[PDB]
Write a protein that binds this ligand. Structure first.
Ligand SMILES: *C(=O)[C@]1([C@@H](O)[C@@H]2C=CCCC2)NC(=O)[C@@H]2CCO[C@@]21C
Ligand SMILES: *C(=O)[C@]1([C@@H](O)[C@@H]2C=CCCC2)NC(=O)[C@@H]2CCO[C@@]21C
Ligand SMILES: *C(=O)[C@]1([C@@H](O)[C@@H]2C=CCCC2)NC(=O)[C@@H]2CCO[C@@]21C
Ligand SMILES: *C(=O)[C@]1([C@@H](O)[C@@H]2C=CCCC2)NC(=O)[C@@H]2CCO[C@@]21C
Lengths: 204, 221, 216, 212, 200, 197, 202, 202, 197
C-alpha cells in the first residue's frame, strides 16, 4: 500500500463548546525512522485546524496548496472561512486529481467563527465528506482508533475530560501499530484559548 | 448499499440506507444517499461515493441553470439525458449507479441509471449490493397504483430486507415521497438498529495522562 | 473437477412442524444453454433423508452412486441401526473436505433434509467443506433472492405448517424464475415427514407480466 | 480454484485468578451474505478448557474433530485428562504438521492451570503460541485489543491502582467491548456467547448484538 | 526483530527484544526470542516464529538423546551442525530461520550463526534481524574482549535500545542472558521506556 | 550505493560524502565530488540515478544564482530547500521524474545552521543529523549514541571518523575516501579528506 | 438477446425478447429493444446496452436534421448508412449489432444488418443476438417467399419463442412491430400468447 | 461435428456428418463417426478423434468380455455405464462427447447422452457436436411422438443437412444407421440425396 | 561475490581466497576459510550458494578420506577432480542441484602439480592459472601478462600481490584480507595472509 509507506495517525474529537485534534509525530521511510517531530496538523484559521495522514510528500503538497486557496479566499471575501466551506474547498481540490490522486486523507476540526459551534469532518482519498457529531480518525491504525473511540467517547465533555479521552485513545491505539507513534501532539480548541500539549509516549 | 424506488398512484417513493463503509469497517452510520436535484426531482446514489456526489451536484447545477433560463419546472427526462450522456462519456470510470425519481407535467417518472450510461424506465427499481434482497420483496408484493401508505410500507420493507441480509447495508431507513402537491423528505423514517447500553465506566479522570510540554495561546474576542 | 460443465442453479429448503420441504428446478445448463430440461436434482437417500444438489451434475451423480451403495450396505446387516440425516450430513462434509484438501474438489453445494426421532434436520454443505444447520436454506442465487423472504417469515413466525411452507417455497420459486437467468419453469418438491420421503414432479409457476404494459 | 474463504468471527479470552472467560460472536458469513446467525465459535474440550476458533469454517470443523480425537487417545494411553498447557503444546504440533498447506484458523485456549489459576494461550495459524493474560482474535481483534490493554493491563495510565480483576468487572468489560465491536465491524453481530470456566465447571451466557 | 550475541573474557552475552508483529499490527510485546536448549546451551529466534520454535525444540530433543546415549553433553559445534543439517533438507520450500547457538563446552565459549539459507559460521560477535544493522554500530564501537561484566551488560542493553529506537519492527523489552562455565543465568528484562528515561 | 552524512552543531554544519563513481563492478572514478555549491553559505548533496543527479542539481544551482543576480541578496537555506522540494514534487507525477536523494546544508545570519533531508518522493524534513545510502543503516545508531546538541566541531569531526570507520569494518562496498566540508558564518570551508589506506 | 426482422410485400415485421442481464441476474425483465429511429424506421439493438442506446440517439438526431433539411421522408438505406459509419468508425470501442428495418416510398420494405465490425448488408430476413444461433436451421427450413403480414408475425413469434426456450440470456415477453405505409402497429406477447412446443418426456 | 440419434417404437436411428478438421483444413472428408460397439449397439463420437477412438475401443473390449461371461446379449444401459465411468474418471484428460444408441430385448430402443464431464442421461432424441447448436429450435419444433422408422430417417437427414449448411466444421456426406431387432441397416446420403433448402435472394 | 585464484609452477601450486562472509549489506565474518583439505596434498576451494558449498565440499572430503582408509593410499589429484565432476554433474539434472564453483589443487609424486577449474555446470578444465568470481574479470589479464611456466614461488607470490592490489584499486567490493596456501612435494603450507590496512 502506498498509504502505509510513511505511516501516520490523526484523530479529531468533539466536546461541549470545544474540539480536540491529535496526531502522531513519526517521519520514517517504511521501517526506518528519520525524524520524530514531523508536522501533520496545520492551522487554517484561529479556531480551525486541518490534519493530514498518508504519504508525507502529498501531506506537504496539499497543505501548501490549501493555504494558497484559503489565503486568496480570505483576501477576496474579507471574512474568515467557515469549517463547512473549508470542507467543500478541500473536497474540490482532491477531486480535481481524481485520476491522479493525492494519497492523503484529511480531518478538519474547528469552531464556527461567529457562533462558536464545534465542527469535525473527515475526507477519504478522493473527497467524500463525512460529518460526525462524535469523532473521526484517519491513518494506518484506523481500526485501533475506532475501537478506542467507540469505547471511550461521551457526549457533552468539558475540555479537561476531552483531553483525557483523546489522549488515552491515541496513545493506546498507536501502541499497537508499528509504523505509527514516536510521540503524540494534541490541540484543544476553545472559544478563548488554544492549548497545545505533547504527550509522554513510547519511542520504540 | 441498498437503494430502491417505486411509482404509486400519485407519485414516487424513494428509499435508502444510511451506512458508509471503507472496506469491511463502518466509517459513517448516518450517510444521506438521497440527493436533491430539483424541487420535483431527487436521486438515490450507489457505488463510489465521491463520484455519486460530484455527478449529482453537477447535474443539479445544470438543471437549475436550465430552469432559470426557461422559467418552467424541470423534467425528469432532461436529468436522465444529462446523466447518461455524462456517464457514457467516461466509459464507466465514473462509478455512479443512480435511481432517479421525479414528478413533472407528464406525471411520475422513475429511472435506473448504470455507470456505463445505460438507462431503464421502470415502475420499480433497486440498486446496490443489497439490490437483490430488495428486488425479492418488490417482486413478491408490488401492485400497480398503490396508495401512499402502502407504497411507503413496501419501500421500507425492501430497504429493511437489504439491511438485515447484506453486510454492506445497515443502520437507518431514509424515505422521500414526491407528489405533484407535496414533497416529504423523511430522515430518519424508521430506526431498526440501536447501540446497546454501556455497563461500565472506563475511569475517565484528570491527571491520568502524562504531559511533557504545554503551550497556551489566548485568543481575542 | 477444476471446471464445471453441466450445472444446476439453486436449491431451496424449509423446515416445518413435522418435517422438511426441499425444492429444485429440473434444468441442466451447458453455459447459458438450457441443454437438459428433464433432469432430477433431488434424491431420496433413505426413508428419513433426502438430498438436493446444485453445481456439477456429474459430481452429483457420483455422489448418488456412493451414497446409495452405502445405504444398501447398511441395510444388508439387518441390525436395526440406520443412518440419520445428521450422520449423512457429517459424512458429506468429510467427503467434500477431503476432496478439497487434495485440490480436486467436487463442484457441488448440497442441502440435506430429514426427519428422525420427531426432530427435523436441514443442513448445508459447500464445495470447500463449509457445513452448517439452519431453519431455512438456499444455495446459489437463491441465497440473494430467496433467503430474504424465507428469513423474514421465519423471524416473525418461527414455526410453520406444511401448507404455509409449501406456499412460501412456491413464492420463492416464482421470484427465482423472474430474476435468475439460469432458471427454468418446471420444478420438483420433495417432502420428508413421519411417513417418509415424497417427491412431487413437474410443477410450474404462474407468472405475471402486467408491468410490460407500463414501459410506454 | 481457491481452497480458502473468509467466514468472519471474533473471539476473546480473559484470564483471572480463579476464572477464565472465553467469548465469541455467533454470525457465520461469506462475502457480503450471511449464512447463519447462530454458529458459536467456542468449543468445550475438558471440564477446565475451552477453545475458540475463527477463520475458514471447514478448517475450524476439521481441527475441532482432530483435537477431540487426540484428547480421547491421550486419556486411553495415559489414564488421565489433559492439562491446558499440554493441549496447547499438542495443538502447536498439530498446526505445524500442515506447514506447507496451512490451517487458516486463529485459536485461543482458555482454562485453568494445575494450581487453579486462569490461563490463556494464543496461536497463529502455523503453531506459534504464547501464554497471555487477555487476547482477542478474528476480524475485530485490532479494535478489541487496545481497549483491553488499557482497561485490563492499565497501560498508559498514571497513578491508577492496579486492583485485581473481578469476574463481575470482566463480564461487564466483555459485554461492552463486543457492543463496541458490533458497531464498526460488518462481520461481527447477532449474539454473544460467553463461557466462564471455574472450579465449579463451565457456565454459559448469551446476550444480543445488533442484527445489521 | 533484534537479536545480539558476543563472546568476551567472562563468557557469552545474549540479548533480544520482545516484539511480535503480523504486518504492521503489533501482535505481542512480550514474546520470548531465546530458547533454553539445555542448562549450558541457548538459542535465539529470528524470522518465522513457528519455524524457529519448532526446529530449536527438535534440536533440544536430539541433544537430550545425545546426552543419554553418549553420557556426555553435546558441543556447540555439533548442535549447530545438527540444526544446519536438519534445515538443509527443506531448502527452497520457504523456511525463514535465523538462529544463534551459544554455549560453553570443553573448548570454552562458543557462538554460531545458522540460517535457513545454509550458512553456519563461527564468530565472536553477531546480530540478527531487522534491527541488526543498528545494533552492529553500537556493538562495534563499544566491544572489547576485556570488558567487565557490568560493562558488557550495559553495552548489550544500549545496542538493543538503539535498534528499537530506529527499527519499526523492534520494541518492547530487552531480555538479557549470560552464558558462564557453570551455565546460563537470566540477567534482566528491562522495558525500553525505562531505558529511554535512563539514557536521556 | 553512495553515502552522504550531515551533522548540525550550535554554529556550524558538517557534511561528508564518498568519492566513488562506479559502473557495474569497476570503480571508474575515486575522486568524484557529490557536493554542489548553491550560494556562499548553501551546499546541496545529491545521490541517486545517473544523469538525474547532475541535471536536477545544476538546474537548482542555476535558479538560485539567478535569484541572487536579480534581487541583490541570497536565498535563505529554508527557502532554497522549499524551492527544491517544490520542483522535485512537481516533477514526481510527470513523465520525467527525478530519482534523487538529497541533503541541503546552510547557514542563515538570523536563523543559524540548518540541515534538511529529502527523499526521492520529495518529502522534506529538518534534522540535527542525517544520512543517505545503505551505510546510513550502519551509522545512524552511532550518531544516536554519541550526538549532543552542544557538540563542538572537533568532536563532530571525531564522530564523523567513528561513522566512517564503522563503514570500513562492516560495509560490503569499497568506500575508501570521503570529502568533508563545513559551513559556518564565514562560509564554506574544505576540510581534509578522510582516507583509509 | 434475440432480435429478428422479416420483409413482406409492403412492409416489415420486427421482433425481440425483453431480457437485460448483468451476468446471471436479470436487471430488467420487460425491456424494449425496438427503437423508433424515424416514423417508419426502427432498429433492433444487440450487444452493449449503453453503446447501442448512444448510437441510436445519435442516428435519430442526424436523421431528423437530414429529413428537415431535405423536406422528404427519409430512406431506410440512409439510416443504415449512418449506423454503418458510426459502427465502423468506433468498432474498436463499441459492441453493437444492429438490425434496421423500415418502409420508404421508393424501395418499399427493407431489412439491413449491421453486425459487429461495421458492415452493412440487405437481407430478406435477419436474425441477431446470442439466441439467434439456436434458430438458424428453423428459419432456413420455414422461410418462404411471398408471405403475408400475418404469416410473418406468426413466423417471427415462433422463432423468438424457440430461441427464448434454449437461451439463458433471452426470455421474458415477445415484442413485435409491423411497419407499412399506413404506419406502425406494436404488440406484446406474454404468458399463454407465446407459442408452446412440447418437451420430450420418457 | 454434428451427431444425432432418435428413438422410434422398436429401435433407433443414428446419423452423423463426415468431416475431420485440423484447424481450417479438412484432413478426412468421408470419415465414419458411427462406431459399432456391439451387434445392436452403436456410438456417435464428438470431440477429440483420438480420445473418442481410444474410449470406444476400450468399451468394445470390456463389453465383449462381459457378454461372453454372461452368455447374454448386452444391454444398452451397460454400454452407456461403461462409457460414463471412463469419461468421468478421465474427464480432466479427455475431450469426448458420446451418444450411445441401441436395441435390447428388455427395454427396446434406447438413446443415452454422455456429454463432456461424464454425466449420463436417457433421451428420446439426442444431438451433439459443434453444429448441434444451429438445429435446437428445429428439432424442438419438428419432433413428434410415435414416429415411424422412415419418418425418423427423414427427420434426422433434414436436421443434419441444416446443420451442415451453417457450420464450417460440419459437412461432407450424411451417414445414417437404423437399429432394430432384425439388425442394422446403414445408408450414405451424398450430393442430391442430401435435402436442399432454398437460400434467400434479393 | 567471492574470489578464488590459483597459480601453477614447475614444482608447486599457489592458491588464495578471500576471507569475507556476507549477509545482505553487512560483513558478518572477516576470517572465513574457503579451503577444504581433501588429503595430504589436495586442496578444494569452493564458492557459490550458501549451504551448497559446505554440504558438497564435506561430502567430497568424507569420500576421499574413506578411499584413503579403505585402500591404504590416496587419490591422485586427477582422480579426485574426476570424482568431483561426476558427482556435481550427476546432481545437476536432479531435484537438488548444487550451485558451486570450484578450484582443485594438488601434487602427485608421478605427475607433478595440478590445478583444475570447475564451473557450476560441472565442466572440468586443466589450467596453468585460474580464477573465480567477479574479480577474475579484473585479474586474469594480469596473469596473462606476467605468467611464465618457469616461475618461482617468490615471483608467484609477487604476482598474486599484484592481482590483489588491482582488486583493491578497481573492484567495488570490500575484500580486505586473503588466505594464501602452497602445495608442494612436502604437502600443504600456510603462508602469511595478504592484508590491506
Ligand atoms: C454503497 O454502495 C456504498 C456506500 O459507500 C455508498 C456509496 C454511494 C453513496 C455514499 C455511500 N459504496 C461502497 O463502496 C460501499 C461498499 C458497499 O456499499 C457501500 C457502503
Ligand atoms: C522478527 O524477526 C519478527 C518476530 O515477529 C518473530 C517473532 C517472534 C520470534 C521470532 C521473531 N519476525 C517477523 O516476521 C516480524 C517482522 C520482522 O520482525 C518480526 C517482528
Ligand atoms: C443482448 O444481447 C444483451 C442485452 O442485455 C442488451 C439489452 C439492451 C438492448 C441491447 C441488448 N446484451 C448483453 O450483454 C446481455 C448478455 C447477452 O444478451 C444480453 C441480455
Ligand atoms: C467434431 O467434433 C470434430 C471431428 O474432427 C472429430 C472427428 C472424428 C470423430 C470425432 C469428432 N472434432 C474436432 O475437433 C473438429 C473441430 C470441430 O469438429 C471437428 C470436425
Amino acid at each position: 500500500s502506498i498509504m502505509s509507506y510513511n505511516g501516520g495517525a490523526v484523530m479529531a474529537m468533539k466536546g461541549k463548546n470545544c474540539v480536540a485534534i491529535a496526531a502522531d509525530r513519526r517521519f520514517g521511510i517504511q521501517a526506518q525512522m528519520v525524524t520524530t517531530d514531523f508536522q501533520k496538523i496545520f492551522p487554517m484559521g484561529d479556531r480551525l485546524y486541518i490534519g493530514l495522514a498518508g504519504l508525507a510528500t502529498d501531506v506537504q503538497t496539499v497543505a501548501q496548496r490549501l493555504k494558497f486557496r484559503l489565503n486568496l479566499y480570505e483576501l477576496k471575501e474579507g471574512r474568515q472561512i467557515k469549517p463547512y466551506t473549508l470542507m467543500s474547498m478541500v473536497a474540490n481540490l482532491l477531486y480535481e486529481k481524481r485520476f491522479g490522486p493525492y494519497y492523503t486523507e484529511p480531518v478538519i476540526a474547528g469552531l464556527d467563527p461567529k457562533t462558536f459551534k464545534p465542527f469535525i469532518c473527515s475526507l477519504d482519498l478522493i473527497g467524500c465528506p463525512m460529518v460526525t457529531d462524535d469523532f473521526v480518525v484517519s491513518g494506518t491504525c484506523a481500526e485501533q482508533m475506532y475501537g478506542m473511540c467507540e469505547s471511550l467517547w461521551e457526549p457533552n465533555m468539558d475540555p479537561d475530560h476531552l483531553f483525557e479521552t483523546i489522549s488515552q485513545a491515541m496513545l493506546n491505539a498507536v501502541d499497537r501499530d508499528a509504523v505509527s507513534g514516536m510521540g503524540v501532539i494534541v490541540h484543544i480548541i476553545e472559544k478563548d484559548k488554544i492549548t497545545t500539549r505533547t504527550l509522554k509516549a513510547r519511542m520504540d | 448499499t441498498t437503494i430502491a424506488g417505486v411509482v404509486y398512484k400519485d407519485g414516487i417513493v424513494l428509499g435508502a440506507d444510511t451506512r458508509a463503509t471503507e472496506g469491511m469497517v463502518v466509517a459513517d452510520k448516518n450517510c444521506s444517499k438521497i440527493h436533491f436535484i430539483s424541487p420535483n426531482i431527487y436521486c438515490c446514489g450507489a457505488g463510489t461515493a465521491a463520484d455519486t456526489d460530484m455527478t449529482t451536484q453537477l447535474i443539479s447545477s445544470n438543471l437549475e441553470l436550465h430552469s432559470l433560463s426557461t422559467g418552467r419546472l424541470p423534467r425528469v427526462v432532461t436529468a436522465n439525458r444529462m446523466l447518461k450522456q455524462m456517464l457514457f462519456r467516461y466509459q464507466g470510470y465514473i462509478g455512479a449507479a443512480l435511481v432517479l425519481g421525479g414528478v413533472d407535467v407528464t406525471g411520475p417518472h422513475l429511472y435506473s441509471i448504470y455507470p456505463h450510461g445505460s438507462t431503464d424506465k421502470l415502475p420499480y427499481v433497486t440498486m446496490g449490493s443489497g439490490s437483490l434482497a430488495a428486488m425479492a420483496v418488490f417482486e413478491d408484493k408490488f401492485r400497480p397504483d398503490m396508495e401512499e401508505e402502502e407504497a411507503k410500507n413496501l419501500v421500507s420493507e425492501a430497504i429493511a430486507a437489504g439491511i438485515f441480509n447484506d453486510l454492506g447495508s445497515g443502520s437507518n431507513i431514509d424515505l422521500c415521497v414526491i407528489s405533484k402537491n407535496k414533497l416529504d423528505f423523511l430522515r430518519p423514517y424508521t430506526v431498526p438498529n440501536k447501540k446497546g447500553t454501556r455497563l461500565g465506566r472506563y475511569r475517565c479522570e484528570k491527571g491520568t495522562t502524562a504531559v511533557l510540554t504545554e503551550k497556551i495561546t489566548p485568543l481575542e474576542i | 473437477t477444476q471446471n464445471p460443465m453441466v450445472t444446476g442453479t439453486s436449491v431451496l429448503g424449509v423446515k416445518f412442524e413435522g418435517g422438511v420441504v426441499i425444492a429444485a428446478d429440473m434444468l441442466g445448463s451447458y453455459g447459458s444453454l438450457a441443454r437438459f430440461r428433464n433432469i432430477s436434482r433431488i434424491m431420496r437417500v433413505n426413508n428419513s433423508t433426502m438430498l438436493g444438489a446444485s453445481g456439477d451434475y456429474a459430481d452429483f451423480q457420483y455422489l448418488k452412486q456412493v451414497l446409495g451403495q452405502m445405504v444398501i450396505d447398511e441395510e444388508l446387516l439387518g441390525d436395526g441401526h440406520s443412518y440419520s440425516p445428521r450422520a449423512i450430513h457429517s459424512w458429506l462434509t468429510r467427503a467434500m473436505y477431503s476432496r478439497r484438501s487434495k485440490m480436486n474438489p467436487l463442484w457441488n453445494t448440497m442441502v440435506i433434509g430429514g426427519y428422525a426421532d420427531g426432530e427435523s434436520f436441514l443442513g448445508y454443505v459447500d464445495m470447500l467443506g463449509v457445513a452448517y444447520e439452519a431453519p431455512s436454506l438456499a444455495t446459489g442465487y437463491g441465497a440473494y433472492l430467496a433467503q430474504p423472504l424465507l428469513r423474514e417469515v421465519l423471524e416473525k413466525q418461527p414455526v410453520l405448517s406444511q401448507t404455509e411452507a409449501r406456499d412460501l417455497v412456491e413464492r420463492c420459486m416464482r421470484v427465482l424464475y423472474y430474476r435468475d437467468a439460469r432458471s427454468y419453469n418446471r420444478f420438483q418438491i420433495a417432502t420428508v415427514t413421519e411417513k417418509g420421503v415424497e417427491i412431487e414432479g413437474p410443477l410450474s409457476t404462474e407468472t405475471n407480466w402486467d408491468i410490460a404494459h407500463m414501459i410506454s | 480454484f481457491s481452497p480458502y474463504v473468509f467466514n468472519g468471527g471474533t473471539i476473546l479470552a480473559i484470564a483471572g485468578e480463579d476464572f477464565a472467560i472465553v467469548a465469541s460472536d455467533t454470525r457465520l458469513s461469506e462475502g457480503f451474505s450471511i449464512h447463519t446467525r447462530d454458529s458459536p465459535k467456542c468449543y468445550k474440550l475438558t471440564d477446565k478448557t475451552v477453545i475458540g476458533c475463527s477463520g475458514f469454517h471447514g478448517d475450524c470443523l476439521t481441527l475441532t474433530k482432530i483435537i477431540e480425537a487426540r484428547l480421547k487417545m491421550y486419556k486411553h494411553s495415559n489414564n488421565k485428562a489433559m492439562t491446558t498447557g499440554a493441549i496447547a503444546a499438542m495443538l502447536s504440533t498439530i498446526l505445524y504438521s500442515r506447514r506447507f498447506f496451512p490451517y487458516y484458523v486463529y485459536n485461543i485456549i482458555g482454562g485453568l492451570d494445575e494450581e487453579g489459576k486462569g490461563a490463556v494461550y494464543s496461536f497463529d495459524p502455523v503453531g506459534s503460541y504464547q501464554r497471555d493474560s487477555f487476547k482477542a482474535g478474528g476480524s475485530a481483534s485490532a479494535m478489541l485489543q487496545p481497549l483491553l490493554d488499557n482497561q485490563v493491563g492499565f497501560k498508559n495510565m498514571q497513578n491508577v491502582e492496579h486492583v485485581p480483576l473481578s469476574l463481575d468487572r470482566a463480564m461487564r468489560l466483555v459485554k461492552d467491548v463486543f457492543i463496541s465491536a458490533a458497531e464498526r465491524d460488518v462481520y461481527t453481530g447477532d449474539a454473544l456467547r460467553i463461557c466462564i470456566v471455574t472450579k465449579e465447571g463451565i457456565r454459559e451466557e448469551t446476550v444480543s448484538l445488533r442484527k445489521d | 526483530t533484534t537479536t545480539l550475541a558476543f563472546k568476551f573474557r567472562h563468557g557469552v552475552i545474549v540479548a533480544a527484544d520482545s516484539r511480535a508483529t503480523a504486518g504492521a499490527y503489533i501482535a505481542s510485546q512480550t514474546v520470548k526470542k531465546v530458547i533454553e536448549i539445555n542448562p549450558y546451551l541457548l538459542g535465539t529466534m529470528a524470522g518465522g516464529a513457528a519455524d524457529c520454535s519448532f526446529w530449536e525444540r527438535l534440536l533440544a530433543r536430539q541433544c537430550r538423546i545425545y546426552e543419554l546415549r553418549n553420557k556426555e553433553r553435546i558441543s556447540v559445534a555439533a548442535a549447530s551442525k545438527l540444526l544446519a543439517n536438519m534445515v538443509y533438507q527443506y531448502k527452497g520450500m520457504g523456511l525463514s530461520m535465523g538462529t544463534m547457538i551459544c554455549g560453553w563446552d570443553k573448548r570454552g565459549p562458543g557462538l554460531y550463526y545458522v540460517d535457513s539459507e545454509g550458512n553456519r559460521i563461527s564468530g565472536a560477535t553477531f546480530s540478527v534481524g531487522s534491527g541488526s544493522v543498528y545494533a552492529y554500530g553500537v556493538m562495534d564501537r563499544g566491544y572489547s574482549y576485556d570488558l567487565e561484566v557490568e560493562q558488557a551488560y550495559d553495552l548489550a542493553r544500549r545496542a538493543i535500545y538503539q535498534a528499537t529506537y530506529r527499527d519499526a519492527y523492534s520494541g518492547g523489552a530487552v531480555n538479557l542472558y549470560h552464558v558462564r562455565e557453570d551455565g546460563w543465568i537470566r540477567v534482566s528484562s528491562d522495558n525500553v521506556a525505562d531505558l529511554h528515561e535512563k539514557y536521556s | 550505493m553512495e553515502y552522504l552524512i550531515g551533522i548540525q552543531g550550535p554554529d556550524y554544519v558538517l557534511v561528508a560524502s564518498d568519492r566513488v563513481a562506479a559502473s557495474n563492478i569497476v570503480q571508474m572514478k575515486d575522486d568524484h565530488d557529490k557536493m554542489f555549491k548553491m550560494s556562499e553559505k548553501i551546499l546541496l548533496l545529491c545521490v541517486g540515478e545517473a544523469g538525474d543527479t547532475v541535471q536536477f542539481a545544476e538546474y537548482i544551482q542555476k535558479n538560485v544564482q539567478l535569484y541572487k543576480m536579480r534581487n541583490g541578496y541570497e536565498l535563505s537555506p529554508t527557502a532554497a530547500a522549499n524551492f527544491t522540494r517544490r520542483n522535485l514534487a512537481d516533477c514526481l507525477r510527470s513523465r520525467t521524474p527525478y530519482h534523487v536523494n538529497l541533503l541541503l546544508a546552510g547557514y542563515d545570519e538570523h536563523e543559524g545552521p540548518a540541515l534538511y533531508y529529502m527523499d526521492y518522493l520529495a518529502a522534506l524534513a529538518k534534522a540535527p543529523f542525517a544520512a543517505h545510502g545503505y551505510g546510513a543503516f550502519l551509522t545512524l545508531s552511532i550518531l544516536d549514541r554519541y550526538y549532543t546538541p552542544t557538540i563542538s566541531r572537533e568532536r563532530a569531526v571525531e564522530l564523523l571518523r567513528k561513522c566512517l570507520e564503522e563503514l570500513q569494518k562492516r560495509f560490503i562496498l569499497n568506500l575508501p575516501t570521503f570529502s568533508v566540508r563545513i559551513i559556518d558564518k564565514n562560509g564554506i570551508h574544505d576540510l581534509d579528506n578522510i582516507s583509509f589506506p | 438477446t434475440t432480435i429478428m426482422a422479416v420483409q413482406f410485400d409492403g412492409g416489415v415485421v420486427l421482433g425481440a425478447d425483453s431480457r437485460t442481464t448483468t451476468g446471471s441476474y436479470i436487471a430488467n425483465r420487460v425491456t424494449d429493444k425496438l427503437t423508433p429511429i424515424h416514423d417508419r424506421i426502427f432498429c433492433c439493438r444487440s450487444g452493449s446496452a449503453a453503446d447501442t442506446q448512444a448510437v441510436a440517439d445519435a442516428v435519430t438526431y442526424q436523421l431528423g436534421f437530414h429529413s428537415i433539411e431535405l423536406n422528404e421522408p427519409p430512406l431506410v438505406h440512409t439510416a443504415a448508412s449512418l449506423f454503418k459509419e458510426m459502427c465502423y468508425r468506433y468498432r474498436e470501442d463499441l459492441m453493437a449489432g444492429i438490425i434496421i428495418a423500415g418502409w420508404d416510398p421508393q424501395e418499399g420494405g427493407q431489412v439491413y444488418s449491421v453486425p459487429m465490425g461495421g458492415m452493412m448488408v440487405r437481407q430478406s430476413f435477419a436474425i441477431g443476438g446470442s439466441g439467434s444461433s439456436y434458430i438458424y436451421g428453423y428459419v432456413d427450413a420455414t422461410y418462404r417467399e411471398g408471405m403475408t403480414k400475418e404469416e410473418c408475425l406468426q413466423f417471427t413469434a415462433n422463432a423468438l419463442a424457440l430461441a427464448m426456450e434454449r437461451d439463458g440470456s433471452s426470455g421474458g415477453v415477445i415484442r413485435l412491430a409491423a411497419i407499412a405505409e399506413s404506419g406502425v402497429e406494436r404488440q406484446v406477447l406474454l404468458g399463454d400468447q407465446i407459442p408452446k412446443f412440447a418437451v420430450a418426456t420418457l
